[PDB]
Subunit: 455 residues, 3 copies
C-alpha cells in the first residue's frame, strides 16, 4: 500500500499571451528552440565574456555551495532509502543482578547472571502502508528540487557576470570620454586665458571657462574610482583574478548579444528552473501526506536475532548454547486526542502553501519576462533619439565655439553647448548599458544560461 | 501545578510623544478612532483602487501563504494539546525464542513462545508539574503570533497595491505631459525653420530648437517603458489580471486619501500587528521556561493495558485467556553534569532575546511613524513651492517665446524657459507621488490596513 | 578513540596584495598597529560621535540580541558536554500483571507483582570512539563562531551610527546653505522688483528672479524633512533618544578621522570577525565528521543501579530487600543499506560547504577593502576639483551679479551663475559625505571598531 495522493499540476494563474501595448512589439508565439535551450556560448557573442563566464562557472563560491547542496540532499535521500531495510548488527550483552527472596524463585536472595553474543535486528519497521516509502519519496523530490535550484543559481551567476562585465565596459567608456572632454575644455580654456590677457575676453568669460574645466576634472576622479570598483566586483563574481591572456573583446557599438525568442508564457513551466524547483517541492509536500495518512494504519515491526547465550562468559560459544529470537509486533492507534488528524491537517496545509508558492513562482516569471519585453520594444527608439540628441548637440557646440571666438555671441551659449553635449554623451552610454542589461536579464528570466551549448 | 513565571509587558523604550520641530506639525494627542481601526475603504477614496485592493486580498499568493501559516501553527498547537492525554491503541505481540538449558527453566534446551493482543496506553506522561502544559502554552502563543503576522502581511500588501497603483498613475501623467511637450517643441522648431529660411533666425537658433525636440523624444520612450513596467508590477501584486468592469479612477490633482490621525506612541503597543506579534513570541518564550523548570521535578509515567495472552496464537481470544498490565514509573534526576540548568539558562536567554526583539519592534515602529510625520509637515510647503515654480515658469516661458519671435532677444532664453518648465512639471508629479506614498506608509505604520470598514 | 580529521586552514583565494592602478595609492605594506587594533575612541575624532557610539553600544537591541545569542550557543555547548557523563537519578517502578493459566508459574491464572526504588543510570553511552566528544567539539566551535559574530555585529553598529551621524550632519549643512541661498535670492528678487516698477527691469527679468526663489523654497522644505528623518534613523540605531547635553561636535570641513593603514590582505585572516566566524563554523563541521565516522565503530552502553526491590509495596525498605543491576552492552553495525555511508558523506559535504563559505568570506572582505582603497585614492582629487569649482562659480556669480544691476548684462547670466554655485555647493557636501562614509566602511572592512581604546 501507498497513500500518497495522485499528483496533478496546478494551472498557471497568468495570461496566455505576453502583454501588448505601445511599449511592446508584436507577440511572436511558440519557438522551436526556446531561450532556455540556447547556450550562453551562443547568446553572448563577446569571446572575452565567454571566457570570463567559464572562469566564474568554476571558481565562484556561491555556485560551488549550490552544487554541494544537491549532493547533501541526495545523501539525505540515501538515508531515507536505507530506513526500509533492516539494520543488522552484532549485539554483545551482559547482565548480573541480585534479587531479594520474594522475587527470586528459590525463596532466598540470589544473583542471576547471563551473557550473550547475538546477530540480528532491532525495531525494524515493515512498510506495509508506505509510511517510510512516502518519506523516501518526499526526500527524493527535495533532492530533485535542489538540482533545479543549482540550475537556477547558474542562470543567476551567468547574468551577474555579464552585467558586471558590461558595467565595467560602460564605465571605461565614460572614463575615456571624460579624459577627451577635459583635454578639449583645457585647450578651450587656454585660448580664453590668452584672449583675456590681451584684453579681448572678459573676466566673466574666463571664470565660466574655468567652471567647465573643474567640473570635468571632478567627473574624471569619479569614473576613475567607479572603473576600479567595477573591476573589484567582477573579480568577486569570478572567484579569482581577471585572466591575463584574454581574447580581444567587443565594443558597446557592436551587437554583443543574440536576439532570443520570447516564446509563450506556458513555456516557462517546463523551462524555467525556479518554477520547476517549486513544482518539485510541491510534489515533496504531496508525498508527505502519504506518511501522515499511514500513521492511522497499523504499524508492523520485527525484532529477530540468532547467536549464543550463556550464564557464564566462558560458556558462551560452547555446544548446546545456541539461541534465536522472533519478535514481531503490530500497533493500531484507536484514540489520540485529535493528534493524528492534526498531523494530517498539517501535511495538507503544507501542500497548499506549496501550491501557492508554485503559483507565485509562475506570476513572478511572467512579470520579469514582460518587463524585459517592454525594454525590447522601447530601447531602440530611445537610443536613436539619444543618438540624434548627441549629433544635434555636437553641431550646436561647433557653431557656439565659432561665434564666441568671433565675438558674435556671449560665452554663456558656448557653456550651455559644452554641458549639453557632454551630458547627452554620458547618457547615451548609460542608456546602451540599460538596454543590454535588460536583454541579459530577459534571457535569465526565460530559462537563463544553464546550457553552454544549444540543446 | 505549572512553573511558568508571571508575564509582565516590558516598558516601551520610546518617547511619550512624537517629535517636534521645523518638519513636524503640532502633535494631535489621543486619537478617538485610531488609524488601525479605520477601514481601507474609508482611507482610500478612489473607487478603482478599492476594487483593486479587494482583488489582491483574495488572489495575492504571499497573503495566501500567510493565511495558511496560521492554520499550520493552529494544527501544531492541536498536536501539543493532545499529548496531555493517554494514547489508546491495539498492540499485537509475538515472541518465539530458543534458550539453552542453563538459561531456560527446564534445565534443558527449549523453545518458549507467547502471544498477546491488548488495548491501552504505552508510556503516558502524567503532567503533574506542567511540563507538557508549558509546551502547549508555548504552541498556542506561537499560533497567536502567526495570526498577528497575517494581519501585518495584509497591511503590507494594501500599502504595496496602493503604491503600485499611484506609481503607475504618476508615470502615465508623466507620459502624457511628455507627449504634449514634444508637440509644442515640434511646432516651435518648425516656426524657427521657416524663420531661418527667410534669414531672420540663425543656424544656431535652429539647432538649439532641435536639441529640445530630440531630448523630449528620448524621454517619451522612457516613460512609455516605465508605464508598461508599472502595470506588470501591479498585476503581480493583484494575483491576477486587471478586472474588466472597474469604476472610474481619480486624478492626482484631486483629494485621494483621508489623512489619518497619528494618536499617541502608546497606541502602537495595542494595535500594530508587528508589535503584538513580537509580544506573543515573548509570551511563548516565557512558557518554555515552565517546561525547563519542570525537568528538575519528578517525571511520572504509566503503561496500562487489558486483553488476552497465550502460549499459542490459537488460544488468544479464548475463555480464561484474560490479561492486564499496570506499570507506573517515577524518575527524579539527581546528577546531570549540569545538563538541566543549561537547558533552563537557554530558556531564560531566549526570553531575553524576545524582550529585546519586542523592544526593537516598538523602536522601529516609532521611527516609521515619525518619518511619516516629518513628510506630512513638509510636503504641504514643498508642493506649494513647486506649484508656484510651475506657474512662474509658464509665465517665463511665454514672455521669452514672445520676445524671441519679435527678435528682441536670443533663442537661449527660450530654450532655458522650455527646459525649466518641463523639468518643473515632471518634478511636481514626482513630489506628489512622494507625498502620497509617505501617507500610504504612515497608515500602514500605525497598523491601519486590516479592516475593510471602520470598527 | 577521536575520529576527527586533522584541521588544515585553506589557503587565501585572493591576491597577495591589494589592487594597483590610476585609482590607487601605492601599497603601504604590513602595518605595525593593525586597523583592527585601533580604538573607535581613537579613530573617530568627534567627541559628540564618541558619546553617541557609547549610547548605541549599550542601548541598541540588535547588539543586545547578538550578545545573548552567544549565551544561548554556550548553553548548547554545555548541554552536549554533559551528555558524556552518566545521568544519575532516583527511579521508582511498579509492575502488576495478570497472567493466564498457560503463562503463569503456577499453571493457573495468577497475578505477578514487582516493585523497586533505585538509584542509577539507564543507557549510558561510554564514549570509546569519541562520538559524543565530536558532537561536543562541534557545539564548542559554533559557540566560538557566535562569539566572533558578536564582534562583527559591533563593528557593523559602530559604522552604522557613524554614517547616520555624518548623514544628519551633511543634511544640516544642506539645510543651512539653502536658508542662506533663499535669503540671497529673495534680496535679489526684491531689488529687481524695485527696478521693475521704474521701467528698468523687464517682465522677463522679474519672472526669472521669481523662479529661483520658488526653486530654493522647495529645496528648503525637502532638506527640513531629510534632517528630521535623519534624526529618526539615528534614534533607532541608538536604541534611545539623542541626549540634550552632548559635547561640542566638529564640522564637516574639519579632520574627523585618523588615517587607518590598509595592511596586507593576509591580516584579514586573523583580524576580521566574520572571517574568523566562518573559520569556526568550518572547524565545527570538521568535528561533525568525527561523529559520523564513530558510527561505524562499536557502541558501548551501560545500565547500572542499586536500591531496594520487593513483591509488595509495604516490604520495600526492609532488611534483605537490597538489589542491584549491572548491564553492559556492545553494538557493532554490520549491514546498513548504505545508511551510515550517506551520513558520513553528508558530514563531509557540509565541511566542503563551509570551506567554500570561508573562501567566500575572504573574497568578499577583499572586495570591500579594495573598493575602500579606491575611494581613498580618488576622493582627495575629486573634492579638490569640486572646491575649485565652487570658488570659480563664486567669482562667476559675483561678476554676473554686478554686471546685471549695472546694466552691462542680462538676468539669464546671473540666473545661470546662481544655479551653478548652488548646485556646486550641494555636490561638495555630498562628495564630502561619501568620502567620509567610504573611510568609515573601510575601517569596518579591515576589522572594525570592536576595541574602545587602541591595543
Ligand atoms: Cl490627497
Ligand atoms: Na509570445
Ligand atoms: Na564594487
Ligand atoms: Na519564478
Ligand atoms: Na485613493
Ligand atoms: Na502568518
Ligand atoms: Na503591461
Ligand atoms: Na516646456
Ligand atoms: Na479586509
Ligand atoms: Na567597545
Amino acid at each position: 500500500c501507498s497513500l500518497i495522493p495522485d499528483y496533478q499540476r496546478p494551472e498557471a494563474p497568468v495570461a496566455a499571451a505576453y502583454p501588448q501595448g505601445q511599449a511592446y512589439g508584436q507577440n511572436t508565439g511558440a519557438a522551436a528552440v526556446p531561450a532556455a535551450d540556447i547556450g550562453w556560448r551562443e547568446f553572448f557573442r563577446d569571446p572575452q565574456l565567454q571566457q570570463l563566464i567559464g572562469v566564474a562557472l568554476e571558481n565562484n563560491r556561491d555556485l560551488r555551495v549550490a552544487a554541494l547542496n544537491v549532493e547533501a540532499f541526495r545523501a539525505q535521500y540515501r538515508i531515507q532509502r536505507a530506513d526500509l531495510f533492516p539494520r543488522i548488527g552484532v549485539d554483545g550483552s551482559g547482565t548480573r543482578q541480585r534479587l531479594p527472596g520474594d522475587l527470586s524463585t528459590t525463596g532466598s536472595p540470589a544473583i542471576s547472571s547471563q551473557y550473550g553474543v547475538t546477530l540480528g535486528t532491532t525495531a525494524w519497521e515493515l512498510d506495509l502502508f508506505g509510511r517510510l516509502r512516502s518519506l523516501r519519496d518526499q526526500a527524493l523530490e527535495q533532492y530533485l528540487a535542489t538540482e533545479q535550484a543549482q540550475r537556477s543559481a547558474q542562470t543567476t551567476l551567468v547574468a551577474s557576470v555579464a552585467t558586471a562585465y558590461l558595467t565595467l565596459k560602460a564605465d571605461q567608456a565614460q572614463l575615456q570620454l571624460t579624459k577627451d572632454t577635459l583635454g578639449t575644455y583645457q585647450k578651450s580654456f587656454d585660448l580664453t586665458q590668452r584672449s583675456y590677457d590681451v584684453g579681448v575676453a572678459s573676466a566673466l568669460d574666463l571664470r565660466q571657462a574655468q567652471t567647465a574645466v573643474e567640473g570635468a576634472r571632478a567627473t574624471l576622479a569619479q569614473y576613475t574610482r567607479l572603473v576600479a570598483q567595477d573591476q573589484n566586483a567582477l573579480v568577486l563574481l569570478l572567484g579569482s583574478g581577471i585572466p591575463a591572456n584574454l581574447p580581444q573583446g567587443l565594443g558597446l557599438d557592436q551587437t554583443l548579444l543574440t536576439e532570443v525568442p520570447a516564446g509563450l508564457p506556458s513555456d516557462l513551466l517546463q523551462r524555467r528552473p525556479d518554477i520547476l524547483e517549486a513544482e518539485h517541492q510541491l510534489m515533496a509536500a504531496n508525498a508527505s501526506i502519504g506518511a501522515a495518512r499511514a500513521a492511522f494504519f497499523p504499524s508492523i515491526s520485527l525484532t529477530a536475532n540468532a547467536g549464543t547465550m550463556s550464564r557464564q562468559l566462558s560458556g558462551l560459544f560452547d555446544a548446546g548454547s545456541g539461541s534465536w529470537l522472533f519478535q514481531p509486533s503490530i500497533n493500531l492507534p484507536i484514540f489520540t486526542a485529535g493528534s493524528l488528524r492534526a498531523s494530517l491537517d498539517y501535511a495538507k496545509i503544507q501542500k497548499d502553501i506549496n501550491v501557492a508558492q508554485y503559483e507565485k513562482a509562475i506570476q513572478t516569471a511572467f512579470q520579469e519576462v514582460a518587463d524585459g519585453l517592454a525594454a525590447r520594444g522601447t530601447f531602440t527608439e530611445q537610443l536613436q533619439a539619444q543618438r540624434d540628441l548627441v549629433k544635434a548637440s555636437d553641431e550646436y557646440y561647433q557653431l557656439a565655439d565659432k561665434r564666441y571666438r568671433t565675438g558674435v555671441d556671449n560665452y554663456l551659449t558656448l557653456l550651455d553647448a559644452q554641458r549639453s553635449l557632454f551630458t547627452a554623451q554620458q547618457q547615451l552610454i548609460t542608456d546602451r548599458l540599460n538596454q543590454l542589461t535588460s536583454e541579459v536579464n530577459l534571457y535569465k528570466a526565460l530559462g537563463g544560461g544553464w546550457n553552454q551549448q544549444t540543446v
